[PDB]
Design a protein around this ligand. Structure first.
Ligand SMILES: CC1=C(CCOP(=O)(O)OP(=O)(O)O)S/C(=C(/O)CO)N1Cc1cnc(C)nc1N
Ligand SMILES: CC1=C(CCOP(=O)(O)OP(=O)(O)O)S/C(=C(/O)CO)N1Cc1cnc(C)nc1N
Ligand SMILES: [Mg+2]
Ligand SMILES: [Mg+2]
Ligand code: NA
Lengths: 802, 802
């Protein structure tokens, strides 16, 4: 248990804590300006000149002093209440407020021994901010206290809420940019309080950083009427409190006393909600939120060159951009840095005075030290059930190609038993698609958690105010909740209709970059569990839905996060349920990855046994010798290669026909896509030798690909024999139609695959047979048109091993 | 002018209109069930059997009767008021309500002469819905009345609002799924009423289709308290009205009279807002919205196999999935279809009776016929100013490589004069980035439109309650507003930080699919203006921001919409401002495209004259003979090829150094990327012959690529000499650093490019020179670390032609 969760003070905030908060605010403002502007002389020791200013002024002042003010008050709260706390910096461009916090709390020096607590250290701390060889401009992963960089705005609230799931002792003040609040993802993020339980989950306090402005405009929320703003937050299930400061001549000490008093009232109400929820965990409370209205750039010069800067968008980036070049700007910077009275804040040795920090939390309650902000320190391996009990054994008993299994249902049963063994640290998320994607065996042991109104057992099924499945019709919510749940040291999976994975392409980009930085250069930030995404309801079988639901191209996006041997991204094609099982076990054991797990949910043949799935998954690509008919590679007329359940079924039916014509070929299944790359691009890929062994030194290869052929083509560009590959993939053809017609219009159906194989072997010789295959596809299509269902020769075909 | 906009009735709705609306509702429900279930016998003529039911039951009943009810009432409104109206079907899976509407209004038969108004036609109309060879399951582009398919949920409101921009006579009832409202994009879409002006823009009426449920869950909005729901919409600046029907035994005629009366009150209030706005166009009104609360699946059987179906998520897709297979389900379907009393709705010849449609609007006010729902019928070419006056003439006067121009500023001046010549049909959108992306010369002739509070001329600049620039910190809003503005026949452009384009990857996917279907098979849907996206503030120069802002991979997503010779997607690299000018003119003249226009906004050399830009843009790739030093292709030791402003600057400096060593090469610039593909994949690409002429038959090619090398590699896989290309691209390396260091860590800097060229020519011979180049890059980096700015030999280099 960290600290004493949810305890009220029952006394006023002390005047000593007020004094310490004002010193914190002044010292973090001063060091924030130092980080932005100063390359040397951090204490402005005589002579202090333009030669001490950075030649390249980069960074963001505007948000920063509002952040620094909140952080003083959140630190004071943590210390007084002994409250387990992780904050979110929505405006992650306020990085210097986040580095200043960690430097004040002591964690910065603990993690970075060279950045010492004295003038030499402070010199280095100032120069290194957004500087070549130094540190980022944003609240990056290498800052102690960060689980959220906030470079790409919008995910503040899904991360805050994901962090408090099954974390009942954790408090998350979530600081949200008022420009950020104009984004889609943030606007829906407010509604998460219908999806958390105040007894089993912790508490988010949204704090709207209402500084009036974004980069070059006012914000929507700052300029509507106060009554609309209050009705808005109340209508989303919050109790709104509003603080306004810095627009008049109120002295700063009074501002701190009024805020501290307000913040105690807010926390008291959180504590009341927490206490009440031990008895009534079904009534959804109105959680507090804070509207925090202060001038953008608060405490910077009011006008600069006749332009309003404090209380404007002009404060957004770097004020006084000429501080190095004109004595006029330099003098303004000098008076601005002096207004914080650094001589009262630093000892002569340049260490921050003890009376600046006596109010601060200590040990693991410090924002930089809390283990929830470094969740791999808390994470434990899942207790996984034995995989064997889930095996589709039909393949062993009856033959390769057996049955009509819906593959994710084996993952559902596996996930069911993972939740049972790990009842509060493995969650499933779905955008209203968990049942549609066939993971609903999980409801045998838990419920979809819903903390909003109930009506009737006739309609409410498998749903309770607490549980380990979460659904909201929002890929942004599913992906954001899950990320923070992993970042605080837990585990899970989500599923999405494949075409709609793209809604969160840019969230995958950011989480992969978080992973890239971490595995490269932040060894103190320990391994988190992986993002596991079941990509299902795929392009080939969108029977009720059509063309808008046909886009497997998240493969292509993921290929753009496969560099430097980071090994943070995996694309798995689950061939059948036994392969799905093997892949998922690997994924649930992995750390520091995004794993995209492709699997079809339609009824489909099972191809391999579980033991075969385990061996093949490890190699990444494998020959299926029981399906090959060639003696050896020199006898092979064409390589039949596939990746994806549906390309594989069609390749396999093609292989059966090609066998019956006396054609000689081998069958290669591809499961771990990126292992097709060269060792030069991926040091864990198949070696040239193993690649040649699978794909031959120079026979034609027909490659039936689940997604866009472009991917395989770019991946194999330097592989031996790549010029012989013919990649067939999805090509933006399709609609609401029969399963055969969907493969047909992409040349993916088994007849077109047989034709293509013939064309690669000898086009002249097989001219007629090709025409005949092409005409059979026309006839099978006419038949679908006339009769309403696919021709029985297509639908009734089982692989001859069965 | 269409109809008589914004006129009140000043009498009750007639009883004859009530009777016609109830008949419409019954006939569209009946034909919706027919489309889903029936392959023959649409009027259930004896014998009506299971043999008349589809073998594959696909589609969505649940939303459909609520849509059909609203559509009856919106048609009645249009007719009574003569009101120019386009609706949005948020739940676009309610396609049969949208096809039924067009069939009732007569447009379906007008566009599809074979689907006739009689029993034979109705037979065909039923079978063809989501059927092989037939029509989609959703409100697809081939349905008259659709500007919005609604397969991928979330964009209902940005499309509604974009449609009414500069469209002051247009009314848009926007029907929004209550599951849809859980998405990010929809949640922010509500706020658009702060960005439209009630005098110069038309009016959206959001109608929340609060049917209680999504696929397998209740919805957030349906289960919060009524007081929270009302405060929510009021707090977003609406006046909420709520209708509740179908939960009790109220007869349907009473339901229609109560709704019609409510809808007249709502419209009267819209008319009052429109009239008031002719005098006071600065006060933002509280626009009505409608909470429409009715049971999901309304009028279907209440229980099926003991399961509550009407008023449940179970009504979502296909009830009675066994209607063909068991007589039990068939009997239920038969009684359900009979409950609408089709014998009162159809004449014996199976034509819909005249008294079903006498209340309907006629001619161009019909929902299917309105030209705003087919905007290419209204669209006119832009009056473009002459390009020459924008030319950066520095290249002609001083030499290739001249100057420090910020390229988008020439596009800003061009856009400025486009707005001036086309003052109400060309808009610019930006996510708070129009000024940052250097398009702010447009503010010389118009303002950012902001219909929300003002504070002071000290802070509010270039902003007014009306204007042709729109900003909101939401890529979803920018992309949605623009799409509908083009779909209703107008023009514009938006700009985004390149890494954040990915937020709307999936919107680009849908709009490209809309375009694919249209250019392939909907000739009646005329060409719209193109989506023009300035992709700027790119990966190489994110000086204030760092790694989270470095992701040029929208290139890769776009490559997945380049099939079948559709020609709906273009990726342009603007080399400099003269190239930018040429590309933009092409884009502003194009139709039916998405054009991604890459351009840097940092100061940069101008390479080509405007006349050269025009020729080179047309070919797609071009030799720069003034920069090549080889005689001819056989004398070439390496091809220096680049795409992007920064790769080009670095290639060019490399070329200067390689020249001074006596190396022989040619320089090829690439502007139109997809013209690198083979003619087999793209019938407008460079032919093999022209490709070979540029890239040689067999010399090494060094290709410096703006984005991920993967793209070029997959694109050129079947081109002559592709095995000789070495593609250098972005490789997930970078942070907040100097411009040289950013190119350095991706091996993109000029020294690494010179090294790479040497390595391709003769690695052994140039071993030493390579090492020396590699060490110079280390020294230039140390210098940045030590001094705060890049080494003057890097920054001060100008191409020797200057
Ligand atoms: C538009 C924008 C910013 C203004 C934020 O305004 P705010 O009100 O949220 O914060 P403050 O006023 O507290 O500064 S900071 C920023 C940068 O590129 C930095 O990441 N960008 C570009 C941006 C656009 N879109 C997205 C999704 N994320 C972004 N970071
Ligand atoms: C989740 C979902 C639907 C429920 C919609 O519920 P609603 O309340 O908005 O509409 P009704 O109750 O009026 O039916 S219909 C649907 C399909 O795949 C169809 O496009 N999907 C999957 C889906 C997920 N995510 C996105 C962005 N779009 C989607 N269409
Ligand atoms: Mg702000
Ligand atoms: Mg609904
Ligand atoms: Na090759």
């Amino acid at each position: 248990v960290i600290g004493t969760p949810w305890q009220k003070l029952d006394r006023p905030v002390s005047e000593e804590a007020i004094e310490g908060m004002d010193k914190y605010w002044r010292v973090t403002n001063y060091m924030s300006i130092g980080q932005i502007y100063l390359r040397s002389n951090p204490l402005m020791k005589e002579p202090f000149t333009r030669d001490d200013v950075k030649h390249r002024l980069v960074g963001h002042w505007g948000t920063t002093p509002g952040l620094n003010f909140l952080l003083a008050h959140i630190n004071r709260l943590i210390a007084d209440h002994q409250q387990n706390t992780v904050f979110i910096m929505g405006p992650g461009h306020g990085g210097p407020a986040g580095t200043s916090q960690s430097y004040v709390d002591g964690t910065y020096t603990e993690y970075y021994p060279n950045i010492t607590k004295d003038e030499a250290g402070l010199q280095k701390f100032f120069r290194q901010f957004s500087y070549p060889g130094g540190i980022p401009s944003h609240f990056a992963p290498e800052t102690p206290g960060s689980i959220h960089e906030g470079g790409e705005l919008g995910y503040a609230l899904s991360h805050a809420y994901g962090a408090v799931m099954n974390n009942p002792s954790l408090f998350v003040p979530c600081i949200i940019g008022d420009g950020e609040a104009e984004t889609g993802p943030l606007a829906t993020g407010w509604q998460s309080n219908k999806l958390v339980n105040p007894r089993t989950d912790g508490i988010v306090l949204p704090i709207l950083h209402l500084n009036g402005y974004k980069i070059a405009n006012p914000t929507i929320l700052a300029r509507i009427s106060d009554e609309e703003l209050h009705d808005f937050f109340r209508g989303m299930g919050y109790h709104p409190y509003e603080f306004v400061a810095g627009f008049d001549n109120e002295d700063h000490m009074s501002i701190h006393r009024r805020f501290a008093e307000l913040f105690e009232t807010i926390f008291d109400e959180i504590c009341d909600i927490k206490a009440a929820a031990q008895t009534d965990d079904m009534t959804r409370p109105f959680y507090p939120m804070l509207i925090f209205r202060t001038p953008k750039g608060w405490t910077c010069p009011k006008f600069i060159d006749g332009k309003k800067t404090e209380g404007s968008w002009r404060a957004h980036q770097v004020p006084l951009a000429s501080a190095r070049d004109t004595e006029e700007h330099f003098e303004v910077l000098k008076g601005w840095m002096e207004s914080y009275k650094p001589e009262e804040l630093f000892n002569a040795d340049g260490s921050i005075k003890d009376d600046v920090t006596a109010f601060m939390p200590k040990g693991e309650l410090r924002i930089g030290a809390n283990p929830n902000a470094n969740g791999g320190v808390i994470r434990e391996d899942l207790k996984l059930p034995e995989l064997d009990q889930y095996e589709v054994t039909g393949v062993k008993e009856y033959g390769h190609g057996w049955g009509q299994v819906e593959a994710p249902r084996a993952l559902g049963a596996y996930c069911r038993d993972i939740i049972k063994n790990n009842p509060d640290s493995f969650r499933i998320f779905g955008p209203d698609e968990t049942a549609s994607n066939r993971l609903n065996a999980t409801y045998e042991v838990t419920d979809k958690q819903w903390d909003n109104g109930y009506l009737s057992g006739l309609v409410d099924e498998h749903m309770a105010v607490t549980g380990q499945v979460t659904e909201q019709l929002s890929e942004h919510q599913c992906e954001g909740f899950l990320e923070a749940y992993l970042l605080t040291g837990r585990h899970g999976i989500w599923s999405s209709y494949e075409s709609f994975v793209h809604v969160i392409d840019s969230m995958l980009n950011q989480h992969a970059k978080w992973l890239e930085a971490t595995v490269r250069e932040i060894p103190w930030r320990k391994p988190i569990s992986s993002v596991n995404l079941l990509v299902s309801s795929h392009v080939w079988r969108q029977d009720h839905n059509g063309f808008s639901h046909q886009d497997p191209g998240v493969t292509s996006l993921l290929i753009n996060k496969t560099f430097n041997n980071d090994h943070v991204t995996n694309i798995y094609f689950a061939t059948d349920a036994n392969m799905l099982l093997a892949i998922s076990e690997k994924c649930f054991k992995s750390t520091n990855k995004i794993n995209a797990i492709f699997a079809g949910k339609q009824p489909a043949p099972t191809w391999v046994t579980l033991d075969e799935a385990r061996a093949e998954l490890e190699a990444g690509a494998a020959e299926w010798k029981w399906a090959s008919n060639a003696e050896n590679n020199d006898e092979v007329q064409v390589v039949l290669a596939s990746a994806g359940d549906v390309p594989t079924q069609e390749l396999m039916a093609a292989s059966d026909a090609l066998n019956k014509m006396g054609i000689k070929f081998k069958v290669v299944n591809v499961v771990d896509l990126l292992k097709l790359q060269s060792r030069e691009n991926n040091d864990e890929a198949l070696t040239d030798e193993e690649f040649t062994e699978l794909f031959t030194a120079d026979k034609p290869v027909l490659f039936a690909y689940h997604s866009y052929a472009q991917d395989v083509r770019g991946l194999i560009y330097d592989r031996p024999n790549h010029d012989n590959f013919h990649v067939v993939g999805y090509k933006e053809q399709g609609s609401t139609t029969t399963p055969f017609d969907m493969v047909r219009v992409n040349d993916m159906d088994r007849y077109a695959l047989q034709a293509a194989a013939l064309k690669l072997i000898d086009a002249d010789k097989y001219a007629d047979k090709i025409d005949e295959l092409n005409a059979f596809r026309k006839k099978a299509f006419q038949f679908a048109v006339d009769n309403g269902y696919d021709i029985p020769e297509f639908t009734d075909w089982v692989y001859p091993d069965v």
